[PDB]
Scaffold this active site. Structure first.
Site, PDB file in Angstrom:
ATOM      1  N   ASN A  35      -9.276  48.231  14.753  1.00 25.03           N
ATOM      2  CA  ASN A  35      -8.192  49.076  15.264  1.00 25.03           C
ATOM      3  C   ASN A  35      -8.059  49.085  16.767  1.00 25.03           C
ATOM      4  O   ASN A  35      -9.070  49.205  17.507  1.00 25.03           O
ATOM      5  CB  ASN A  35      -8.500  50.524  14.799  1.00 25.03           C
ATOM      6  CG  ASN A  35      -7.308  51.440  15.024  1.00 25.03           C
ATOM      7  OD1 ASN A  35      -6.167  51.068  14.762  1.00 25.03           O
ATOM      8  ND2 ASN A  35      -7.586  52.668  15.449  1.00 25.03           N
ATOM      9  N   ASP A 105     -15.434  46.071  15.149  1.00 27.61           N
ATOM     10  CA  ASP A 105     -14.826  47.395  14.871  1.00 27.61           C
ATOM     11  C   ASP A 105     -14.623  47.622  13.389  1.00 27.61           C
ATOM     12  O   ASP A 105     -15.560  47.457  12.597  1.00 27.61           O
ATOM     13  CB  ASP A 105     -13.533  47.482  15.694  1.00 27.61           C
ATOM     14  CG  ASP A 105     -12.902  48.862  15.735  1.00 27.61           C
ATOM     15  OD1 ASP A 105     -13.353  49.801  16.405  1.00 27.61           O
ATOM     16  OD2 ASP A 105     -11.895  48.988  14.997  1.00 27.61           O
ATOM     17  N   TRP A 106     -13.423  48.000  12.929  1.00 23.83           N
ATOM     18  CA  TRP A 106     -13.287  48.183  11.474  1.00 23.83           C
ATOM     19  C   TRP A 106     -13.361  46.880  10.734  1.00 23.83           C
ATOM     20  O   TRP A 106     -13.604  46.896   9.535  1.00 23.83           O
ATOM     21  CB  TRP A 106     -11.943  48.877  11.208  1.00 23.83           C
ATOM     22  CG  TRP A 106     -12.121  50.353  11.418  1.00 23.83           C
ATOM     23  CD1 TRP A 106     -11.618  51.141  12.413  1.00 23.83           C
ATOM     24  CD2 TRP A 106     -12.912  51.198  10.566  1.00 23.83           C
ATOM     25  NE1 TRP A 106     -12.028  52.440  12.233  1.00 23.83           N
ATOM     26  CE2 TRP A 106     -12.819  52.506  11.105  1.00 23.83           C
ATOM     27  CE3 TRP A 106     -13.646  50.984   9.404  1.00 23.83           C
ATOM     28  CZ2 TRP A 106     -13.467  53.580  10.502  1.00 23.83           C
ATOM     29  CZ3 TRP A 106     -14.291  52.064   8.819  1.00 23.83           C
ATOM     30  CH2 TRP A 106     -14.199  53.353   9.371  1.00 23.83           C
ATOM     31  N   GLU A 129     -19.607  45.047  18.770  1.00 26.65           N
ATOM     32  CA  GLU A 129     -18.973  46.356  18.910  1.00 26.65           C
ATOM     33  C   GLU A 129     -18.507  46.857  17.550  1.00 26.65           C
ATOM     34  O   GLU A 129     -17.328  47.044  17.283  1.00 26.65           O
ATOM     35  CB  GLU A 129     -17.803  46.250  19.901  1.00 26.65           C
ATOM     36  CG  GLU A 129     -18.365  46.368  21.326  1.00 26.65           C
ATOM     37  CD  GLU A 129     -18.828  47.800  21.557  1.00 26.65           C
ATOM     38  OE1 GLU A 129     -17.957  48.677  21.311  1.00 26.65           O
ATOM     39  OE2 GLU A 129     -19.991  48.053  21.930  1.00 26.65           O
ATOM     40  N   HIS A 269     -15.268  47.920  24.724  1.00 29.70           N
ATOM     41  CA  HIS A 269     -15.101  47.791  23.296  1.00 29.70           C
ATOM     42  C   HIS A 269     -14.377  46.522  22.877  1.00 29.70           C
ATOM     43  O   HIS A 269     -14.862  45.788  22.018  1.00 29.70           O
ATOM     44  CB  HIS A 269     -14.305  48.977  22.730  1.00 29.70           C
ATOM     45  CG  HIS A 269     -14.248  48.873  21.230  1.00 29.70           C
ATOM     46  ND1 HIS A 269     -15.373  48.944  20.442  1.00 29.70           N
ATOM     47  CD2 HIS A 269     -13.206  48.699  20.384  1.00 29.70           C
ATOM     48  CE1 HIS A 269     -15.009  48.821  19.166  1.00 29.70           C
ATOM     49  NE2 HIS A 269     -13.696  48.671  19.094  1.00 29.70           N
TER      50      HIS A 269
END
Length: 293
Positions: A35, A105-106, A129, A269
């Site tokens: 995201n 991330d996701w 990350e 990130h």
């Protein structure tokens, strides 16, 4: 560079048209964004793996060029729903049984979970990350802690659906170098319209397994964390400095994982935008080691 990699292909999944990049031949190297990003996140990293396999980067449902779910609302685009679409897409792409996952991330929560559920088909996992385990608010990076608490409150809809805060504030704020006009246009494109078009970018922070909620995602992440901590599958940990999510306790935990190579690149990130060549070179080297001659 701002140019995308390869060109978008589409396939119907559960009646909804999903978009993806699929370039090259051989065993897949599967790049999964999170995201509020898309396959575009990897555009400067995938070139490094030219020739090394079938380079694939899917757009999560509701993201990139993938269709929106309608009717959308606060119950849509939860982890489980994304997983339903992504599992089906990955099945449709006929990936075979020697997949290298490259996740963020996701994309890491989804890929770690997919790996746990299809472990015999996973040749290696490169991650950065990532959401590597359930965390507590003290583990959440301080700079955006209050903002993410607000996302997980009734204030989230105005922040994100109305004002597009995840795309326009969080994304650049967690990239160390300035983005170009074209780069921002590509990230904003799936989210130009206010309202439900932006719902995936609000549902996602609401799904992060933090302080025990949501319990289903906490359970799923507890499961893959325990599995990854024991799995002998080769791993590449791309650590970031300063990094953001995979720091502190979570980084400590990741560093415990077996059969793992680690490099550190500059980044917060969205580190693909700060160190794409360092990251790509590391991934390509990992894959060459996993796929000798």
């Amino acid at each position: 560079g701002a140019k995308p990699f390869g060109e978008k292909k589409f396939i119907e999944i559960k009646g909804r048209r999903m978009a993806y990049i699929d370039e090259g031949t051989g065993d897949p190297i599967l790049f999964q964004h999170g995201n509020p990003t898309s396959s575009y996140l990897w555009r400067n990293i995938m070139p490094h793996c030219a020739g090394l396999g079938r380079l694939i980067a899917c757009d999560l449902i509701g993201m990139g060029d993938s269709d929106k779910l309608d009717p959308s609302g606060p119950e849509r685009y939860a982890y489980a729903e994304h997983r339903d679409y992504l599992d089906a897409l990955w099945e449709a792409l006929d990936l075979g049984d020697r997949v290298v996952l490259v996740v963020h991330d996701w994309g890491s929560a989804l890929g770690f979970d997919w790996a746990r559920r299809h472990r015999e088909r996973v040749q290696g996992i490169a991650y950065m990350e990532a959401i590597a385990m359930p965390i507590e608010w003290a583990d959440f990076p301080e700079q955006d802690r209050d903002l993410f608490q607000a996302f997980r409150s009734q204030a989230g809809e105005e922040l994100v659906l109305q004002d597009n805060v995840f795309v326009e504030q969080v994304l650049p704020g967690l990239i160390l170098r300035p983005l170009s006009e074209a780069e921002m246009a590509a990230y904003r494109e799936p989210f130009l319209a206010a309202g439900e078009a932006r719902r995936p970018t609000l549902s996602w922070p609401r799904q992060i397994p933090i302080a025990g909620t949501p319990a289903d995602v906490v359970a799923i992440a507890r499961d893959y964390a325990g599995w990854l901590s024991e799995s002998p599958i080769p791993k590449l940990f791309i650590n970031a400095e300063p990094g953001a999510l995979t720091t502190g306790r979570m980084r400590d935990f990741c560093r415990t994982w077996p059969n793992q190579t680690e490099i550190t690149v500059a980044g917060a990130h969205f580190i693909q935008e700060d160190s794409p060549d360092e990251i790509g070179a590391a991934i390509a080297a990992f894959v060459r080691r996993l796929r000798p001659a």
